[PDB]
Design a protein around this ligand. Structure first.
Ligand code: HEM
Ligand SMILES: COc1cccc(OC)c1O
Length: 401
């Protein structure tokens, strides 16, 4: 596409540090565009993302670096009968009525546990000390990984993050940085060493943990799903399910700090926390561009005639700054009207844990503002956001009296 020759000069590093400038151009110039360094078409607007995600002429496909990292059958990358089975496998503990039965007793004590370590220090780095630990500990306990230290869970999602977003390709469409997959392989090897003994145990002695239910639910008597069949979805969980609620909380905090009167309102009136989180998810989408669909027949989208078999990456983080939908989208605004957003995706492969994730983020922020209501950002330290596939702040230094 000749007028997009400037896309040839876009680098992976640039997209990781800040993708919003490139994607603002894409939204205006080519809502569906082939990005050479990513080796793929990408959808940048809300209209195109939603259309691709819900179209009957498209089905799920894993991103190339996602597939190299997760293998088969990752719930995000399969369709038909296998997807239906994996959806019914993960859905019971995520059902709203079920979450409402125990989410409070799960997350609130965990939030208190981590707050107690620093709430009187007067200084903290909330990503490492609060947002990520609460996120991984809550889901870890739900999964049956109580004995896996929160530092380990955080290290796993960081390595799987970097591996699955190791997307750069060279002039011949080959992965430019194949060594970047090695730490994804190392994380998987460690996960196998830890989780395989637990699966051995759950096969014979099922309990209340989610993974035990993944092995047993809906199976003939005495039978379990093969572990190779469920491991890629375990990996999917140990990346995005572990990582995203922590990044959603932190981005919401960074956005509130950017609007000090709005932060005061939320501390004064914690019933506004769910609305603050929804704006946070739109403002810096935790899953920014990590999933994709592939066309199953010839289709025309945003004026581009796509052949069958064409992958399209869904850059929901860009769709969420669509100026056809939002005014001044790069500005966090609690009082934006409650409009649809794509931070949870859309269609048959839309996020399965929305209700759970929203409560995890809500409860964590509630307990934070109660313990430290004079929270202030440490304006001596800058907040840098990182990631093209998954995006969030690398740290969040705060102070208080
Ligand atoms: C703030 C937190 C979260 C955000 C923003 C988020 C966002 C997303 C997005 C954008 C997708 C891809 C949707 C698409 O391709 O159309 C996805 C998929 C998924 N998420 Fe969430 N997620 C979050 C937390 C969680 C949690 C905590 C869990 C599990 C407890 C979870 C389970 C899943 C599953 C199973 C899928 C795959 C759905 C499928 O392909 O059928 N997510 N998520
Ligand atoms: C590419 O990896 C992922 C994509 C979307 C969601 C995930 O976890 C829920 C995830 O681990």
């Amino acid at each position: 596409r000749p007028d997009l020759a400037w896309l040839d000069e876009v680098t992976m590093t640039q997209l990781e540090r800040n993708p919003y400038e490139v994607y603002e151009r894409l939204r205006a110039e080519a809502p569906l565009a082939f990005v050479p360094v990513l080796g793929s078409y990408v959808a940048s607007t809300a209209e195109v993302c939603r259309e691709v995600a819900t179209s009957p002429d498209f089905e799920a496909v894993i991103t190339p670096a996602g597939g190299r990292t997760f293998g088969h059958p990752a719930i995000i990358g399969v369709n038909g009968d296998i997807h239906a089975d994996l959806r019914s496998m993960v859905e019971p503990a995520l059902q709203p009525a079920e979450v409402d039965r125990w989410i409070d007793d799960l997350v609130r004590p965990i939030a208190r546990r981590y707050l107690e370590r620093f709430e009187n220090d007067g200084h903290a780095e909330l990503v490492a000390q609060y947002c990520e630990p609460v996120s991984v500990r809550s889901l870890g306990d739900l999964l049956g990984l109580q004995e896996v230290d929160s530092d380990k869970l955080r290290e796993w999602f960081a390595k799987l993050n970097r591996s699955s977003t190791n997307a750069a390709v060279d002039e011949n469409g080959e992965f430019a940085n194949p060594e970047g997959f090695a730490e994804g392989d190392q994380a998987k090897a460690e996960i196998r060493a830890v989780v395989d003994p637990l699966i051995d145990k759950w096969i014979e002695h099922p309990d209340d943990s989610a993974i035990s239910h993944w092995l047993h639910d809906g199976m003939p008597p005495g039978q379990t799903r093969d572990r190779e069949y469920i491991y890629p979805t375990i990996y999917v969980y140990l990346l995005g399910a572990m990582q995203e609620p922590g990044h959603g909380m932190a981005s919401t905090l960074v956005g509130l700090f950017s609007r000090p009167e709005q932060l005061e309102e939320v501390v004064d009136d914690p019933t506004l926390i769910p609305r603050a989180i929804a704006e946070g998810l739109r403002w810096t989408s935790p899953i920014w561009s990590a999933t994709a669909r592939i066309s199953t027949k010839p289709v025309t989208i945003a004026g581009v005639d796509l052949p069958a078999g064409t992958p399209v990456m869904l850059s929901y983080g860009s769709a969420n700054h669509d100026t056809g939908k939002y005014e001044a989208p790069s500005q966090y605004d609690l009082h934006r009207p409650p409009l649809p957003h794509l931070a949870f995706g859309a269609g048959n492969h839309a996020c399965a844990g929305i209700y759970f994730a929203n409560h995890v983020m809500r409860i964590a922020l509630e307990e934070l503002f109660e313990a430290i209501p004079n929270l202030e950002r440490d304006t001596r330290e800058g907040v840098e956001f990182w990631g093209w596939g998954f995006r969030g702040p690398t740290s969040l230094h705060v102070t208080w009296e």
